[PDB]
């Protein structure tokens, strides 16, 4: 029993609430439905203009979201990438697939725990808002991660 862990290691729910509060202060969307979690990031704070090149400052927020994702115990996580319609459906589908691939590879490089990482790119097929005035400044240019906290 003293050898048995009373808590799961590296768990503090106060820190969980603190970093969720700071995430919503930063404005990236965080949602919990029962035991399922979905996080959405705008692509304007991550990439360049319609290109899968990563800004050097974005790795700090990548470290923060990896530290958040370290907390839960889960088996499978899924990343999806949404963008705008630019030239062809093929172009933005490939761009979303590449962006999801790169962020998934970085997340596997970081020490997050899962057995399955699924990555999908969808482009501009499901707009969350009909306000399609902007390009990459439009908020539908985004990346989502979904999982379920299991026990």
């Amino acid at each position: 029993v003293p050898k048995l862990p009373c808590r799961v290691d590296g768990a503090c729910d106060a820190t969980i609430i603190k970093m969720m509060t700071d995430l919503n202060k930063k404005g990236i969307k965080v949602a919990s439905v029962g035991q399922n979690y979905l996080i959405s990031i705008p692509a304007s704070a991550l990439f360049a203009d319609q290109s899968p090149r990563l800004n050097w400052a974005s790795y700090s927020l990548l470290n923060e979201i990896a530290a958040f994702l370290k907390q839960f115990r889960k088996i499978a996580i899924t990343v999806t990438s949404y963008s705008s319609k630019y030239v062809s459906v093929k172009r933005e589908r490939a761009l979303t697939l590449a962006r999801s691939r790169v962020v998934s590879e970085y997340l596997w490089s970081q020490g997050v725990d899962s057995r399955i990482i699924f990555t999908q790119g969808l482009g501009s097929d499901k707009p969350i808002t009909s306000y399609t005035l902007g390009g990459d400044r439009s908020p539908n240019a985004r990346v989502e991660i979904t999982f379920r906290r299991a026990v």
Binding site: L4, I75, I116, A150
Partner: protein, 103 residues
């Protein structure tokens, strides 16, 4: 066969099917004459009757080898095996070790 007979014939037969106690293990009923054990590691129950570990769970055991397995209709499983303080299981693609006391 004479009283001075050198050898007796070799006899075999059908091997036995299963133990009757395993069905009570599937129900979770401990067998008579046994005693309860301590399970550490998750959802599993264990007993010792006749120098054999009897374990009711729904996971899949890996390391020490078991002598008999029984399946329910709901994924519940019963294992009759050797006595061992440690167990290895696969949960959902993750490897776990189980500590058993009372041996």
């Amino acid at each position: 066969y004479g009283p001075n007979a050198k050898s007796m014939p070799t006899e075999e037969g059908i091997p036995p099917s299963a133990n009757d106690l395993l069905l009570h293990v599937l129900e979770g009923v401990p067998p008579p004459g046994s005693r309860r054990l301590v399970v550490s590691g998750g959802d599993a129950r264990a007993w010792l009757s006749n120098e054999k570990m009897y374990v009711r769970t729904n996971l899949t055991i890996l390391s020490p080898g078991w002598l008999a397995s029984m399946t329910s209709a709901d994924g519940t499983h019963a294992y009759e095996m050797q006595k061992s303080p440690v167990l290895l299981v696969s949960w959902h693609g993750k490897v776990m070790q189980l500590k058993v006391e009372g041996l």
